[PDB]
Design a binder for this molecule. Structure first.
Ligand code: A1EIV
Lengths: 472, 309
């Protein structure tokens, strides 16, 4: 508690006074080492104590004098002062470094032959990339990202870990321009060695997190998949165990898009990281942050429509750690569903209050896959257009992943998917209309709109043009 | 009285730049009001709590309960219409709806559409006009990209995309219609030792235009050239491999049979003796070897390229 802080405060003052008073390089290094040991002692305890020491360093002006030591010519004091900095770049400090500290750390990153200094400045860049977007553009536009790549070229283990974390944090907090710059600067290729190497598991895990966060961007998927780095994500996630890493909030807001990525490797990485976080933080008293974020619903959607074993296992274990019971898998053959399957699907998608209404009207797979605005509005009681739009989004989710073999005859679902992944929702309407691959070249706009149910005009135009052109 | 607090809050909430953020935050901190909290640019990935925070920041705090009950999120917020506000959410007043639309356009203009956009359509819309970028989510949700825009019509935009203003639709349509119109190297490595050097070699060669396969006989078939990673004890399994158990043995035997260029890469491993190795494979020792330098990796890769086809 704060009693340890009270004990460390005279130690903090003595260490800072010795560090500032020291004029010789070795004496400065000794004071910096005193501060380094004090900071590590607080970290080993716990988070509040280290944050308080970092606050005291800022109040004393010790971070500005630390920057002064960064501009110092002597190599040893630079190296070990940089170790102190990489230890103390807590969030309030990153602000002040964003203000004036930037532009000097870049100078450190320009020359990197000393291994320990290179490791320390790599960690410093890693920590600064998390702070804000303008910091990301300022660092990436300069030679910082080139420094990170060249450090990834080197074989130092801690340096490689730091560079993997740096690239990951830059990916999470960069934005469109920053990530496009990273892609153009060949980030995925240089992340490949970090993920592929068998020496360190955490290194590959962090590199896979970075490449998954890159793959979350639709435009980036070109270059990430052409790099080939994501191919190692799935075997890795299948291999390692979250529990031993557990033994070994805003970040969770960053991770949740990985669960809702729609990309396999990104979902695997997000499931693993969130399961590890759920374990370690459910070891703690409170578990509310996951519900605040919406992680439970995303994991339930992951389990319910899962096609792949590893994601299923990770999401199931993550939800099993929490108090909620595991969502139950759904049968892909929706046209063959019954009333109970509809009730289960409604309970899973969150529309539990409408289970009674669907049961009284006896909705089944045919009715569910041919439900319209009017039926929900009047028959089932979804008066709210927002609620109806939500139900339509989830119905499109169900229809996209469904088994239409019992109904389809000409493999029309694959054709619709080949035109567009989201076109597959219309397969049941098209087949119930009696249309097949051969019959599509006599279809008109009004027929689609009225009978098939393709409300959007753009989708109808694309479908008609593609049918008329390629089907002949 | 002037409205400075609201303007500073709007400055902090949608700030992209550090200095303005700092100044507005300190100015509001001097006053009794608490600092407005920054919003995540990726609005399509928002949740209910992000919507509640954004509503509280834009001044529409009284509608937070209504948005929460209907569970509005990033998709719903970015595809909200006149009717939904009027009936579902309770914004009966057209003035209030127009204010909410102004702030929604403010949010949509500065938003991250990378998770949704595929052809960088937001930059195209912004290039036509800075205020055109609000329509990016509607256009991408419609399935349109840069290539698909040259078949779009006015009615499609108006109904599906949500571009109510006719002038914007005309400009977008005119602008679209007018301006819119076997690996080279195989890597064989020891799993425990050769993997890291193999990774460096593969990434360096792919940077320089050489396709490389890593991680089986058909793999030797497809390879234009064969590169063996002579890691410390690389041929440890290959020594006295009469049964050809090692995959490296099979790969290199097949490479010699096919005649592909085999380039040993010595990095920390001595040349294996001919007598201990099987007779068929004593020929690879005669092939030229390349030293690998940690200090100069690019020089080593340039040497490989000079030896590469
Ligand atoms: O601001 P953040 O990244 O949340 O943490 C603050 C600093 O703590 C150091 N550090 C080191 C070893 C253990 C721990 S707990 C924290 C990190 O290097 C970071 O610079």
């Amino acid at each position: 508690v704060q009693d340890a802080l009270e004990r460390a405060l005279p130690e903090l003052q003595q260490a800072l006074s010795a560090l500032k008073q020291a004029g010789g390089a070795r004496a400065v290094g000794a004071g910096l080492a005193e501060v380094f040991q004090l900071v590590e002692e607080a970290w080993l305890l716990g988070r509040e104590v280290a944050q308080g020491l970092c606050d005291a360093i800022r109040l004393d002006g010790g971070l500005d004098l630390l920057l002064r030591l960064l501009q110092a010519p002597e190599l040893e004091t630079r190296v070990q002062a940089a170790r102190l900095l990489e230890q103390i770049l807590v969030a309030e400090n990153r602000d002040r470094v964003a203000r004036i500290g930037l532009g000097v750390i870049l100078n450190l990153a320009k020359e990197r032959e000393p291994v320990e200094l290179a490791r320390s400045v790599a960690g410093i860049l890693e920590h600064m990339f998390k702070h804000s977007e303008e910091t990301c553009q300022r660092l990436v536009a300069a030679g910082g990202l080139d420094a990170v790549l060249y450090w990834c070229r080197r074989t130092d283990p801690a340096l490689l870990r730091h560079c993997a974390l740096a690239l990951g944090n830059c990916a999470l907090h960069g934005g469109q321009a920053v990530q496009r710059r990273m892609v153009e600067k060949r980030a995925a290729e240089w992340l490949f060695p970090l993920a592929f190497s068998k020496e360190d598991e955490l290194l590959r895990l962090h590199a896979c997190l970075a490449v998954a966060v890159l793959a979350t961007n639709k435009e980036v998927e070109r270059e990430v998949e052409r790099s080939g780095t994501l191919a190692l994500v799935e075997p890795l996630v299948a291999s390692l165990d979250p529990g031993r890493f557990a033994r070994c909030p805003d970040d969770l807001q960053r991770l949740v898009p990985l669960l809702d990525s729609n990309r396999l490797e990104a979902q695997c990485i997000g499931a693993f990281y969130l399961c590890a976080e759920a374990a370690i933080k459910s070891l703690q008293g409170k578990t509310k942050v996951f519900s605040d974020i919406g992680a439970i619903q995303s994991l339930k959607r992951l389990v319910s429509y899962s096609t792949n074993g590893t994601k299923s296992a990770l999401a199931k274990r993550a939800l099993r750690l929490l108090g909620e019971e595991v969502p139950r898998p759904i049968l892909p053959s929706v046209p063959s569903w019954k009333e109970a399957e509809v009730q289960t699907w409604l309970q899973q998608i969150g529309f539990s209050k409408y289970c009674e209404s669907f049961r009284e009207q006896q909705v089944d797979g045919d009715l569910l896959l041919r439900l319209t605005e009017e039926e929900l509005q009047t028959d089932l009681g979804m008066k709210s257009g927002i609620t109806r739009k939500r139900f339509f989004r989830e119905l499109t989710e169900l229809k996209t992943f469904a088994n239409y073999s019992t109904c389809d005859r000409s493999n029309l679902a694959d054709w619709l998917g080949s035109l567009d992944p989201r076109f597959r929702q219309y397969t049941y309407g098209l087949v119930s209309c009696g249309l097949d691959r051969s019959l599509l070249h006599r279809v008109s706009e009004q027929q689609l709109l009225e009978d098939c149910g393709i409300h959007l005009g753009v989708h109808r135009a694309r479908i008609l043009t593609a049918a008329r052109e390629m089907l002949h | 009285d002037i409205g400075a607090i609201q303007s500073l809050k709007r400055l902090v909430s949608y700030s992209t730049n550090g200095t303005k953020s700092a100044l507005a935050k300190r100015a509001l901190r001097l006053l009794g009001e608490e600092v407005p909290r920054p919003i995540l640019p990726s609005v399509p990935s928002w949740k209910e709590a992000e919507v509640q925070t954004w509503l509280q920041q834009i001044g529409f705090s009284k509608y937070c309960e209504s948005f929460r009950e209907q569970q509005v999120d990033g998709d719903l917020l970015l595809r909200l219409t006149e009717e939904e506000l009027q009936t579902d959410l309770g914004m009966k007043s057209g003035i209030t709806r127009k204010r909410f639309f102004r702030e929604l356009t403010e949010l949509k203009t500065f938003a991250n559409y990378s998770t949704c956009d595929r052809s960088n359509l937001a930059d195209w819309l912004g290039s036509l006009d800075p205020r055109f970028r609000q329509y990016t989510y509607g256009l991408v949700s419609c399935g349109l990209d840069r290539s698909l825009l040259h078949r779009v019509s006015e009615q499609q935009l108006l109904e599906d995309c949500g571009i109510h203003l006719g002038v914007h639709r005309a400009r977008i349509l005119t602008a679209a219609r007018e301006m819119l119109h076997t690996p080279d190297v195989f890597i064989s490595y020891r799993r425990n030792s050769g993997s890291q050097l193999a990774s460096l070699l593969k990434v360096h060669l792919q940077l320089h235009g050489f396709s490389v396969f890593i991680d089986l006989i058909q793999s030797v078939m497809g390879a234009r050239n064969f590169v063996l990673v002579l890691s410390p004890g690389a041929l440890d399994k290959c020594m006295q491999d009469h049964d050809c158990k090692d995959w490296v043995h099979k790969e290199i035997v097949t490479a010699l049979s096919c005649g592909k260029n085999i380039v040993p890469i010595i990095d920390g491993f001595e040349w294996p003796e001919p007598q201990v190795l099987p007779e068929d494979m004593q020929a690879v020792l005669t092939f030229n070897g390349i030293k690998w330098s940690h200090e100069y990796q690019e020089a080593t890769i340039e040497k490989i390229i000079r030896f590469l086809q």
